């Protein structure tokens, strides 16, 4: 029932001459905004993606990032010269806040380098990873020496971040509370051993990500029931496949049980024969 805000940032620096920075934002499991290196504005996908903020409470933010986009790039360009970093460069930044019931919450700001995070933001000062290289330490000093930025960030994690979330939940509850009924079926998989076959349980086109699915013999949960990873789709409804290796003679009375919020106890009744 928790819906964290994940602001995602991707910035690649192949050579000194060329770079691109794009970013987006996830709430819980939904995308609201896209932002290219080509666009001077962040794109509100939903009509309610703007939340409660007026076109000025909104544009104000666009003024910051647009400057922040330009600002961030030179820094790292000169950063690398100070730090002698063999190009190319890949930097990722995960950030946001998550609210607790009532008027309490917590924030975060995790930056990563070449698929390995470097530093975070604790309280009112920059703090590196306990498993971070040293050069990061000298870099930690430099950034802490720009306070207005340090302040500018707390003003966002502390405070302004959560209010906007509240300005979205009231604007997006309808989409938020939406539920989608899955579409399930069965199919044969190639045999993983002699006689013993692989029984596949298919689930597709549902909404709220979290679901529990197990292959069962009426009511007996089958250990061999193995499933893969939940995977997306174009309209935000996901997909999943659960498998099981059993012998043909044991396929009598077997059934795949499907448990998800979209139905409440009217589970997908699929015994072996459909």
């Amino acid at each position: 029932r928790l819906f964290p805000l994940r602001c995602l940032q991707i910035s690649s620096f192949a050579n000194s001459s060329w770079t691109r920075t794009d970013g987006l934002a996830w709430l819980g499991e939904l995308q609201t905004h896209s932002w290219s290196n080509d666009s001077d504005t962040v794109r509100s996908l939903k009509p309610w993606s703007q939340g409660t903020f007026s076109d000025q409470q909104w544009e104000t933010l666009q003024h910051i990032f647009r400057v922040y986009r330009s600002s961030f790039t030179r820094d790292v360009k000169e950063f690398a010269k100070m730090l002698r970093l063999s190009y190319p460069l890949e930097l990722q930044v995960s950030a946001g806040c998550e609210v607790h019931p009532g008027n309490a919450s917590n924030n975060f700001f995790h930056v990563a380098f070449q698929g390995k995070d470097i530093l975070s933001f604790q309280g009112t000062s920059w703090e590196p990873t306990q498993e971070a290289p040293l050069w990061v330490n000298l870099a930690i000093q430099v950034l802490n020496q720009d306070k207005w930025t340090r302040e500018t960030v707390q003003w966002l994690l502390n405070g302004t971040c959560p209010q906007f979330v509240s300005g979205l939940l009231e604007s997006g509850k309808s989409e938020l509370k939406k539920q989608v009924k899955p579409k399930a079926w069965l199919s044969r998989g190639p045999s993983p051993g002699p006689g013993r076959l692989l029984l596949v349980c298919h689930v597709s086109g549902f909404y709220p990500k979290p679901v529990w699915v197990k292959w069962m013999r009426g009511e007996q949960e089958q250990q061999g029931t193995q499933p893969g990873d939940i995977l997306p789709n174009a309209d935000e409804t996901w997909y999943l496949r659960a498998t099981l290796d059993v012998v043909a003679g044991e396929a009598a009375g077997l059934s795949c049980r499907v448990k998800h919020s979209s139905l409440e106890g009217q589970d997908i009744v699929l015994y072996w024969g459909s």
Partner: nanobody
Framework: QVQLVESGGGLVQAGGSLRLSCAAS????????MGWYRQAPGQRELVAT???????NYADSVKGRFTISRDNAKNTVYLQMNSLKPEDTAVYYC?????????????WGQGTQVTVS
């Protein structure tokens, strides 16, 4: 879209004391800062940091002389002007903006006048 109410102006003599009003509403923005800027005819000078919630810092020319207060609900702000000086006459504007520069969120009140005799 914001609300502009400035109230508490007037004429006084040397050594007087006054109190000023300011509030905002509509498309507001959680943590923010309000306060005033006086403009001696010539030039707007900071006088009062509000830092909604956050500790604050006055001007040295009014160090301890003047003191502010926060509505803490109606998001309104009151400033207590005490021990006024004659040379302290100027145009006093209320400002509500956030502690990040150059944003379009920098709103300015209609303006209030203060005259010390």
């Amino acid at each position: 879209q914001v609300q502009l109410v400035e109230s508490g102006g007037g004429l006084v003599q040397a050594g007087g004391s006054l109190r000023l009003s300011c509030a905002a509403s509509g498309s507001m923005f959680s943590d923010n800062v309000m306060g005033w800027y006086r403009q001696a005819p010539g030039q707007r000078e900071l006088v009062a940091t509000i830092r909604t919630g956050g500790s604050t810092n006055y001007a040295d020319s009014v160090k301890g002389r003047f003191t502010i207060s926060r509505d803490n609900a109606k998001n309104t702000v009151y400033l207590q002007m005490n021990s006024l000086k004659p040379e302290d006459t100027a145009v006093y504007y209320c400002r509500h903006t956030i502690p990040v520069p150059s944003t379009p969120y920098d709103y300015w009140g209609q303006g209030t006048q203060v005259t010390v005799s």
